[PDB]
Amino acid sequence: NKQEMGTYLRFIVSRMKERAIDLVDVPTIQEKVNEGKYRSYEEFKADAQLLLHNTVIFYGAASAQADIARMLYKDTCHELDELQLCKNCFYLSNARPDNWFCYPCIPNHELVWAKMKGFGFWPAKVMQKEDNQVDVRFFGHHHQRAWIPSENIQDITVNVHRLHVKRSMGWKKACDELELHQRFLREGRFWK
């Protein structure tokens, strides 16, 4: 996918320029993406790596600039990890049309109630799992991520009154978003 990769990489570069306002060349990577020249994510990663190295050498391994660069390289690698987890999620998370988190993916994310100590059960999408814990992304404001122990999870088709919940404004908005998602899912309303 020539254009798809190009689109994703543009989000990353743009975001890392925004990250960089904390306080190989950047235009070169910026040039390369803009022209859609990258042939692999791995190749993009190796350029970001080169840039990091040149940067730390340029300014000193303990400069403010080298600290920034190390942070940016880690964030870029995180964005690339996430892009591999689910490309649709990544696209919608960056383009953010109205109700972006409600559009289904293929395959569909498993939906759960996930409990974090002190918050009660909150609705979430499962992004990945291992035997002892599950990486979820919550519905509702900020759409944050947590690793949740297996026994702090219930499937979404369990009735909510059977669960320990704390019914805040934020919790109610999360639940409204969940139900909109469940509807889009049954409708086959994919993002176009």
Partner: peptide, 11 residues
């Protein structure tokens, strides 16, 4: 915050 969400802080 990462595009696909920052880590949710414990209570």
């Amino acid at each position: 915050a990462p595009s696909t969400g920052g880590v949710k802080k414990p209570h």
